[PDB]
Amino acid sequence: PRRRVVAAREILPDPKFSSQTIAKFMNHVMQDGKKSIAESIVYGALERVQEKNKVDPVEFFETTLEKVRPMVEVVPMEVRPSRRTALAMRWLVDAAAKRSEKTMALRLAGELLDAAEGKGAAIKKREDVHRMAEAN
Amino acid sequence: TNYGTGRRKTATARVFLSAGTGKLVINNRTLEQYFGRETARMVVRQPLELLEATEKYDLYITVKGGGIGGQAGAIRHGITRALIAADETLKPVLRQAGFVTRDAREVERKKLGLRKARKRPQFSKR
Amino acid sequence: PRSLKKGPFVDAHLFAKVEAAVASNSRKPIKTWSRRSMILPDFVGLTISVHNGRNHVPVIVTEHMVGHKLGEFAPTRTYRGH
Amino acid sequence: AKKGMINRELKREKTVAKYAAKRAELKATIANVNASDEERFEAMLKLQALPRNASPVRLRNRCGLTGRPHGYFRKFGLSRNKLRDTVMQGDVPGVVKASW
Amino acid sequence: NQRIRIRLKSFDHRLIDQSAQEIVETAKRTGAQVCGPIPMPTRIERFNVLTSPHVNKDARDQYEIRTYKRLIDIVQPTDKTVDALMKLDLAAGVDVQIAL
Amino acid sequence: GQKVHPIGIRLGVVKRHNANWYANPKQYAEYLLKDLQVREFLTKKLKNAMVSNILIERPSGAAKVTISTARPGIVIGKKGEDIEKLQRELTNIMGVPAQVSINEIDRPDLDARLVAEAIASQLEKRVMFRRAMKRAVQNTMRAGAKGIKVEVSGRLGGAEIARTEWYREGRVPLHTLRADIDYATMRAETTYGTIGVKVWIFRGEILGGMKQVMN
RNA sequence: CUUACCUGGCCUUGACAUACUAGAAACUUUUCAGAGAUGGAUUGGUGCCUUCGGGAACCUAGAUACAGGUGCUGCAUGGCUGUCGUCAGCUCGUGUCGUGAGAUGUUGGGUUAAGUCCCGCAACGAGCGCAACCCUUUUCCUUACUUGCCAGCAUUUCGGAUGGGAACUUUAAGGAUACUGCCAGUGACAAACUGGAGGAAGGCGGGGACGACGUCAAGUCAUCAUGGCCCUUACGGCCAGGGCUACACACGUGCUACAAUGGUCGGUACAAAGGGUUGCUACACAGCGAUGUGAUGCUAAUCUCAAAAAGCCGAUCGUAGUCCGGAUUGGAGUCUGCAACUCGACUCCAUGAAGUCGGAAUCGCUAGUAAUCGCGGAUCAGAAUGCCGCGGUGAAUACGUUCCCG
Ligand SMILES: CN(C)[C@@H]1C(=O)C(C(N)=O)=C(O)[C@@]2(O)C(=O)C3=C(O)c4c(O)c(NC(=O)CN5CCCC5)cc(F)c4C[C@H]3C[C@@H]12
Ligand SMILES: [Mg+2]
Ligand SMILES: [Mg+2]
Ligand SMILES: [Mg+2]
Ligand SMILES: [Mg+2]
Ligand SMILES: [Mg+2]
Ligand SMILES: [Mg+2]
Ligand SMILES: [Mg+2]
Ligand SMILES: [Mg+2]
Ligand SMILES: [Mg+2]
Ligand SMILES: [Mg+2]
Ligand SMILES: [Mg+2]
Ligand SMILES: [Mg+2]
Ligand SMILES: [Mg+2]
Ligand SMILES: [Mg+2]
Ligand SMILES: [Mg+2]
């Protein structure tokens, strides 16, 4: 903007698990203001993963995001702490969209479970990005 | 016994708070009947949830105007103000939480020559 | 379409000409400007010359025409392609 | 506007005034159920037999100071050109520039 | 069981307030009891007027006119109250309607 | 750029309307048109009476017209015959009885309209525009205005190419809403066409808002 | 109709003004011819003032000065408007300097939205612009208590419905509050900028009006006014039909979709601003429906347009050109209008096109914003996907100034 340090916005923690990571992922899922639908999708996916394996919903999500997070992007440049999280959050929903399970919440839960083991489309995309990073 | 008035985006809420067991009535309805969005219920419950006083009070609330989110915010502001009226020593923690502030954001008016408040018609040089 | 409760519309000055023609057996065409009048059963077997803006075009009324407007048979624009 | 157009509008308004009563009576007769169908048909024919300038649909609102046929504003009976000038001089009561 | 209802309309709230206060003062002086003035919702009419004569569709003036209303009730009226209210003068810009 | 009308922008702030009456939405148009015809008739009839302000009111089924003039005697008449005739004509234009009140102007040099007519008459009588502008600008300042501005546009001296010339003394703060500014316009019809005259007069600032004027 | 255009039919001191002369109240009832404009017949009446001698209004007949022109010139003009651009500039007095025209002030280091402010400095000071004074929104107080309100009482056909209360919401006039005021850094000990407490709100809180000196002989003689030049049995005026809606094509601005974060069906919540007496209409009956008939309340915080829609719960559809999409076409109807052929809107049955997310390129947006959902109004007999407004739900991202534009 040529004259200001415009401050970063502060989004409220989610009303259920009180996690800003879940809040930001919810905002990434939301389209054109349909927060209720985005909330239903994400909260259903989390409940499904919890039922399948009994773990704290927040810990599993943070661990999976850590696996999915890119290191660098192409002269190669190191991305700042927020940009990696944004990229991982985007690619997770992108892969869940192309998944072919019944409902969006269920296929999001399936994608998260696959990424946790490492046999997931998002993890494969990260591997492809890493492979291309060797060009320079 | 104590009273509070809450406002958020054209929604106004009248909250009467008395020492009780935990009943909560909105517009002669019950919380789950009035709000079908669980997030709205949790937003409403935040104040007493913070103070661990859910079972120490009863709530009789009327609300008018706005939409679902606006009415939920107005009810939360009203409950906060009623708690302040009941006791002043609570106000520090409530302010730290952020429930004291009256959110002043409102819709911006549409402007002549524009499609919306800020959105502009598509431009072409040739 | 005009409401059925009001009935079909015919200009009175054209209706009088039609009635006189049918009462007689004059085959002479009836010249009119009423493109908006409805073609009735009494018009069948007659020639009506309908204005199109610059000329009157003759129309011989058949049974299949009943229910149409007079102007439907007198086009007003000329076009032969680009 | 040309003075002929103003005179045409004045003539049409006078014609409508001259026939309002007969027109109302005829339409009432048409809409009267208790009357026989023949009377209603005669009423319809008499209604169609009036001069065309008896129809209010052919009146067009004009400025009132210039005769402009566009931009009328029924409330003031003036067109936009004259309304702007008259308002900005303070000659139209209660009207001010709007900011909200 | 006699109760006088007064309704005031204007395009200027200052003038309407002056008139209403004069009415209340007159009624109180004659000795009746009054309720009001009660402010009713205001009407706002808005207009968009092109400022250019020919082709500048984005160049407009926005005007508004506001109709203000007030309501007053006089109960337990004395004999002199009606005569005093009738004798009260009429001020331009304010319309007064009395209902008995 | 183009500038807003000095009086219109101040109509609700520090200035009053020249028309003060109420009307239902049905009679508004008729009342407005009849008032406009009254203004036209007065403007034509009282050209030589140095009349600037016309204020129309409709108290109750009747009309009161207040005419501000510098020459009250001309409008009133020797025996008061003229006022009765004016009332009769104004009543004919209206549909209700009309009564006229006269307001004498003590300082014609501080009124923008009268100054505008003074300049326009000279320009028609072939007085040099710069001379007329300087004379008016000096007379107003000597009368005691905090500021004045005069502008003349058209074919000055019958030239082929029109131009605009302006002259000012004092201060004229147009952007200050509470500032009291008199404004007027006038046409001077000459052999080569029309020359337009504009006059601003700044007389000081109003403190207290529209309330002080007792609206 | 509008309407300025075309075809044909018509008038000529004219549809409209003033001046002169004569006769008739003005008006008004029924026909005929005609596409109408027009023409020709044809009933009823003798009005308001008079020093009643003649006059007012409004008509008819003659007469010439004249009227009339959306015909040309925006490059002969007034008025009005776009644009750079809400960009930060534009200048004077007194002083000094120069033989001079002129110069300084207004330049330099910072800062700011800003010629905003402080520093320095032969400059010392002031005006128009900036800002502020005006409107609206967020917190609170006073006045007001109906047609709006219902905390406590009661009476309740469980509807503020009634007796009632003046608490609360709200309606709308007047007031209060923010000032870098207090604290810690910071900078030149300045200006200014950072980070804290309080506070509903914190560093011009958020928006709207307000357009400096000037630029493009930029737009408008078709709102209007105006110099000059043109026509006058027509370039003026009256009328019926047609055109402005044409269609091998090319562009700009929009709407609707290509679906599962979705479509359909059943149930069920939550607004704000506007409109309404030649108008909006509760309610009943008829119709599948657009609507029709009867009837009720409203000139409206009183009655009414009115169903908010996205939302929530349940069922089904299971990636198909489909229970996506809704163009086109065939039938049948309603309403407004003298009249829906050219050329209206809307309703029902049937039909079911392109479209699988769009090339080189290119547009808007920094927060209650974008996106998405519905609601209202001016124009208006009828005719919005346009324009001007209203609220509901509610994001992402700015490291930075190299490159592109002003
Ligand atoms: C592309 N086009 C929009 C131009 C454009 O783009 C620009 C721009 N700034 O870019 C503009 O200037 C324009 O729009 C414009 O307005 C112009 C005129 O007025 C004008 C004019 O009036 C006369 N006048 C006469 O010939 C009269 N004579 C008297 C005796 C015989 C004839 C002569 C003349 F050459 C012109 C030039 C135009 C140019 C025009
Ligand atoms: Mg608003
Ligand atoms: Mg919106
Ligand atoms: Mg059809
Ligand atoms: Mg003309
Ligand atoms: Mg029309
Ligand atoms: Mg036409
Ligand atoms: Mg020009
Ligand atoms: Mg300013
Ligand atoms: Mg030009
Ligand atoms: Mg041009
Ligand atoms: Mg025609
Ligand atoms: Mg067109
Ligand atoms: Mg569902
Ligand atoms: Mg479908
Ligand atoms: Mg295909």
Ligand SMILES: [Mg+2]
């Ligand atoms: Mg910006």
Ligand SMILES: [Mg+2]
């Ligand atoms: Mg309409």
